[PDB]
Amino acid sequence: DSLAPEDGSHRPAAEPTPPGAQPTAPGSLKAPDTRNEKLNSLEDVRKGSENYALTTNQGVRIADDQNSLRAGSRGPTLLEDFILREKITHFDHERIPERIVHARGSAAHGYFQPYKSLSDITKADFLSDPNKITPVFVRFSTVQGGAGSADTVRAIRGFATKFYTEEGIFDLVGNNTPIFFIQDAHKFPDFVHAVKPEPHWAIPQGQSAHDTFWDYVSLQPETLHNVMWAMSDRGIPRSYRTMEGFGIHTFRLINAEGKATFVRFHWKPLAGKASLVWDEAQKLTGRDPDFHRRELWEAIEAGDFPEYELGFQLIPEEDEFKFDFDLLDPTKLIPEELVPVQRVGKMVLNRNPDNFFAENEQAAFHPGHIVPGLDFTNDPLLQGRLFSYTDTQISRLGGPNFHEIPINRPTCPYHNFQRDGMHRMGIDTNPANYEPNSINDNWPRETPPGPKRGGFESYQERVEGNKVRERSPSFGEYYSHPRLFWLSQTPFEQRHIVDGFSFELSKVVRPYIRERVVDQLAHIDLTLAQAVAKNLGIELTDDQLNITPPPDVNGLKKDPSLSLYAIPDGDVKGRVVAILLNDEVRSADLLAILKALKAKGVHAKLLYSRMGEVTADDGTVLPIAATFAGAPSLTVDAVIVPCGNIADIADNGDANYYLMEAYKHLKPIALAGDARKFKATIKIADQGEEGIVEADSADGSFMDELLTLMAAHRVWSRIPKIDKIPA
Amino acid sequence: DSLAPEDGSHRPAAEPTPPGAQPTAPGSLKAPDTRNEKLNSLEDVRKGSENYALTTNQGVRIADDQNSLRAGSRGPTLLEDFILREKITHFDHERIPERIVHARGSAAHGYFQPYKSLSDITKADFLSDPNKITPVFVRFSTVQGGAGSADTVRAIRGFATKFYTEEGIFDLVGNNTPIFFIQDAHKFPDFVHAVKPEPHWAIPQGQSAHDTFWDYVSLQPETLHNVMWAMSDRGIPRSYRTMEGFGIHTFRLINAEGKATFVRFHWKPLAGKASLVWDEAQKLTGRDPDFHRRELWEAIEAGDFPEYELGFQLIPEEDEFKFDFDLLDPTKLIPEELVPVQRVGKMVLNRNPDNFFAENEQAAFHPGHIVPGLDFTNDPLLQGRLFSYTDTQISRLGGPNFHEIPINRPTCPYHNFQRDGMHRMGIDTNPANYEPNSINDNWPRETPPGPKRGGFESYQERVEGNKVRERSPSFGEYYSHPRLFWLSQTPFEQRHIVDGFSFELSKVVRPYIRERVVDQLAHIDLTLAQAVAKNLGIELTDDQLNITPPPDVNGLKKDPSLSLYAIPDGDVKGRVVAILLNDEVRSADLLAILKALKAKGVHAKLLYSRMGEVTADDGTVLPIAATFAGAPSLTVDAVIVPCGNIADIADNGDANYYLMEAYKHLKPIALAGDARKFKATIKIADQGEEGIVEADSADGSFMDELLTLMAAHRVWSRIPKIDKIPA
Amino acid sequence: DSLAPEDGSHRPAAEPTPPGAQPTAPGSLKAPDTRNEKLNSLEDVRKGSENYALTTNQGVRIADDQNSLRAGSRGPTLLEDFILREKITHFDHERIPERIVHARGSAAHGYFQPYKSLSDITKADFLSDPNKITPVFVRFSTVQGGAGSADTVRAIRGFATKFYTEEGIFDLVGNNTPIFFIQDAHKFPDFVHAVKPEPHWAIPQGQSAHDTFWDYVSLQPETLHNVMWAMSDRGIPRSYRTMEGFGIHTFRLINAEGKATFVRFHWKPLAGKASLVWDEAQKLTGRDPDFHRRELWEAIEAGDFPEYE
Amino acid sequence: ISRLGGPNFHEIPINRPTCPYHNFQRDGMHRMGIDTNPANYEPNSINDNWPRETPPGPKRGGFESYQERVEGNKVRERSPSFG
């Protein structure tokens, strides 16, 4: 019609902009100049809209898209309206089956680059040269919930990366914890069914806080290690950018000389590790179920590209049996204290998709999609995975041609004798559809293995034993890893774990299941067990109190790399601050606050009791981002309150409650001049308290003190103080 | 490698060659320079093969494509063989559901052009200028059989044209007879179930000759008009090049002024009309089930392009009710004597597909795919068709995005708010997915209907009546068109129809059904009825002999345009002759023979009792294409026997049968010199017989006779003599 | 209505009758006293029709099944004609993808019984006792052609038997020749693409007589053994009743003591071995493309039950 | 048809009618119902046209649409009264 505003305000700028500054938009409109090979190769399917006639799928233009065709303007709809029928028909068939697991996820385009050639240890083309850039598509996710469940639930997160190499797609389909729950793939449906919503009533969505999960866990002690990790703050990450990623399984690197090295893949978050606290995460699933998704998208639109360092734990073939645990057991981790992570490369995510359904929804990642230079191992969990991803995608994606769906296509050439199938796009001209053939001179042809561009040959591992359905006795050890994890945690981390098991176990209706988990915890650590028992009104028996603790892991009593916070890796860029306005802000405070934040790449959100504008003491007009209720403290990392007419919000329940929720969830809080009248709301001494920045104005050290607090993430020392506080 | 022959004889020349002279090939390899807009736009999806590596669909080069991965070379196959599984999965999912009806069909690419601008009568853009060339994709088919059934069955044939216009796809989905079997789409499942394979045991394939087909016919006399056509030689075409096409229904043309004109669409074969004879057709279903498909492919490879003229029967809106049948009645034809066909354009089929599955199996035609300039009518069968083709495509082609399947894609722009669906290819960047929207300035936008490039608007036909499930009383007349068709046939076409009914009803097991059908014939024509009753050994009753024939149609007692043969229109270009060889052929007969065939564009096939070669009297080495049994007379249009050493083949029972068969099927036979010894095998008098060319040698006179006869197609005066030929 | 004839000649006698004497019928109307455990458990899904009202699939009775709902009897069909849309919808979605290979086939119900207990060599319950009868379902087929292809082509024939045993279904999926064309499963798509219709034009239907098949055969000498059989009269059986059947592979028999015995499975036609001649066979693809399916259906209807040892 | 994979969604247990349902529709993906009727079309003589149509009537009658009068031109238009 010509419905946009004449000021062109309906359209976000094609330049990096801070979160909330502009309406968010499709990747290619938001950042047209951010390219990569894969992004360029999708131009054949991108479709514009501006200046084009509205049409049917057959290209016939539509005159009236507001009405069905009827016999009289008040008459019956006619079957002949083919415009209405194609339109409703496409609408009626929009949905596809969501992923069996990892239905909820958020994705983005990016690129990867190795620091140096790894040719000595792997002939994988994407790792052979530091100037070799490989496009990537990454999808982060939760395990249990459907596609419409919440982001900040407690859960293990999925971390899958599609590498569009020159010698094939390589998918690294990992999680954000270094182990999995089960050992053998045959039990996946059992474990997954136990964690998913119970079969009679489909409750609860996106949560393990229910009977079947803990029932399973309590009868399968192999699960404890990963359960420890999910029960910790690892299970509620601050963002997909602030968690670690792992392949979990031991795989093989094969070099040109044919030598196999055992490898465990890792991703290190260059923004560091940071997690929410439980009450915040649970509230955030309600106030904004799309928090991670939104944050990922906005970090990319703001230029805060999520960056990760690919790392490798490398173990020589000769050291296979040198640990107390089996290298092929997925419920066991390789302590970095024993086997360090070697820095391999950097992955940068710098552009959102155009259409979520087309790119994110249909992305198909598979762990068996490896390339020459990599190989598998006999890890029994991995072994079954190679069966499952290929299988599930014939029904999710409607057929065997899911590789022709734009996001999934190789950027490298692909030729073979495979034909037909639903949705076939490629029109093969080869006179032959079989080999060996003479009619096309046998093309395309097999290709011998070699140092570069050769065919895929599996490493000749010796295989020996009888056909058996048997767990390896080396896998029958379930408690030392959980114990190692436990002892590597800070005290406040240990308390949060205790609190996760406690909350969780309290949602289990059948008491005996709770007791059974407590007994299992007593096999790991008595202090953990007791603390959780106590929260559940359970007493340990004299026998539980004497269970002998599991042995150290290869002599290790703790590995600080297992903690989120024991070793400071804080990084403020991309974090966000809430600024609580009033109707006459000391503009001097605001300029100081704002400039200091921007200097460190920390965003702000101007908040108030209504939308619109307020005018500072000097006449500066301040645009309001959202209300105290509309953009709660759960969505920010810190809260700053500038002086002015504090009496304007001093008695505002929402303004006060904002501070209480923020204080409760250990976020740094800064009160300027009269804003200190809010000290009484959170019971802050006259003298002060670590974690609360206060001054007569937002000058001098005020923002630096506040920014040092943001660097340590949360004010852990405040925990005991929050114990009470009614919020 | 190098498996191909060093001589390069595995590869067909990329130049037009006669049927059987080269191996057939994918169209773009056979005629890389035959181009059209649609063909060039499929180049984004065409895939080569020569000089490429064999890879997985993920682009991973395969080293060994001869073996699965196993533990030991006599060991068990390993689940980690992702290369085997990908290849077997794709293979396992190759098939899609064939079309419910018209499953068996053959298709080629071509182009269309009008003879002149038709803007006085229609604003359809493809009809607006003689220089507007429109790419087409045509699919010819049978109705009843599966995708695997025979081409030369007795059946109605489909003739479907997809026009890729600049204002959208228009699909003209017609058949080879001017009417359909039934009146209301509600009975289509009933009719179709009656003719398809009976349900208990799924017999018979591709045949109407069974109990349920004739039970339905006998109880639903609206079907008799299409049945008369099916039982004539119209039901057994020589080729898809030599049959007519019809849209069947009355549609509308809409001009720039908005005046509506009633039109019935027609395809006139420029090769002319020709059909087989029942016994030849039926025997051809066993010797070459792919006969028509082959014939179409090879006509195109030889440069014998199937050409059809598009014709319109135009009726003014005011003459809606001037006939004695209802224009909306699909079981009624508009006699060309009443309303002549206006020659409007020509379609040329000039290129085979590259991959049958990709382009022919997945093509989706729909009668409802119309463009501004055309509209529907209330024809109750067409109204139901508008619903079905859209609906069936969702399962056949797996989703609502079948228009993104390359062969189906419009070549003109297409933009709307439709999103998702299984296998979405298009990646929409539009910020909006709804209209009206302000966020993308309401684009894509509606376009008012107009003279050119306008949006679609239905002709504003007045609708008046009550909501009723009721047949219009004007449709209740079932014998006059059938009779009109019967009186318009030559005496031998009449005879073939009688034999078509007799043979078919002879296969109906319940004798009461045959009697009921015969009662129906008595209402059409008593001569027809008795001749059919006589072969079933049924006696017409007194009452049935007095049934008063139906009235003429608008005073017509016959219309020659309804006969295949009444008016000479045959063309020899593209036909084929079998040349029966001997071990010492008179090389001067071959020379005169081949020179004249070549002058008319008639093809030849050199047959012998073994493959290899034979040497003429002169020393010319003559390559043999096939043996006598290998390329039966059924596959050729005429048989010529050159002189030489006739003793070599004069006792060959296959050679004798070759002539007995040709003879029985009314085919021209020419005997040179001593070849005249074969006359005793087909009991031809010493003085000769019309239909048989004989002479001392194969000079110019003899070949001119053979070519005159061939242009008359078959030797209809021979019918009476074949009775006494055991063949 | 009074649509059936008064003399009742539209209904086939529900007793054994020779080929062509009556119209053929669904097994349970033709032979209602024949039964087995598998036929009895299908009873819950079998649907009749005599004396019932014609309805939609939601159970609504239909008054007029001859017409669409329109605005005037010469008017446009309305979108609210839900009876027409359900019927056309069902019609529209009747087909499912044919079998990748062995799409052309004919089956029948029956029963199996061991001569004596084989518990010394196998603990398989269906062979544990001579009184133990196992209901079977058997589908015979060709390999190459589609579901609408001809029966008497030159082909290897499939012989699949589904054993509804008391300790699970056992499917014995074999062919009428003792070997297969190829050695490793990895080459299956290769071989099958070569035998199937060439990809450019989708010719020829149900025939190995074309270039790609022979190209393959010539480059893969391991195929020669099954080609030899296919080129013989084994490739054109007179009927499914006169062909042998083999499981092809070596499988194992496992007894209660845990002992393994190698085993090759065989089916012997109690009607003896018999085949057509090539010319007859190919002409029969033309005159009656459903000859084997019809012959099997009629043998059973006549009481000439196909028997296999 | 896509959500429930075919036209036999009425045979999925929760969706089935508890009253009689008999017609001539056959096949489709996941067909449960094994039809024994010799005929799969009507009118048919071989099953004496069963199952049969049933006239509209007060109870147990076939569906017949109310005969509403329809008068207007074929238009894509919003009634002015909905404005």
Ligand code: HEM
């Ligand atoms: C180390 C253990 C595992 C890890 C780290 C893992 C990781 C993942 C991730 C990250 C995804 C989501 C991919 C996306 O974003 O599209 C996923 C999906 C999936 N996983 Fe795994 N998984 C594991 C074990 C398994 C096992 C044992 C099985 C079954 C044998 C399995 C079957 C699946 C399936 C069927 C999907 C859906 C994939 C699709 O629809 O494309 N996973 N898994």
Ligand code: HEM
């Ligand atoms: C004038 C009478 C009819 C004619 C000339 C006609 C013509 C055709 C043709 C030529 C095809 C094959 C297109 C191709 O080559 O892919 C076809 C397919 C089909 N017809 Fe019709 N038809 C008629 C009546 C009907 C009716 C009354 C219905 C149902 C209401 C119907 C439903 C279909 C369906 C469902 C297909 C399959 C299409 C596909 O799967 O893509 N037809 N018809």
Ligand code: HEM
């Ligand atoms: C020992 C050689 C083989 C024999 C005797 C054999 C036998 C058969 C038979 C008799 C059928 C038809 C079953 C029916 O009547 O529905 C069939 C179908 C099939 N065969 Fe095999 N086959 C052989 C090799 C293979 C191989 C090597 C593969 C793949 C690696 C394969 C894959 C298939 C598939 C996918 C089907 C279709 C099954 C369905 O859709 O239900 N066959 N085979």
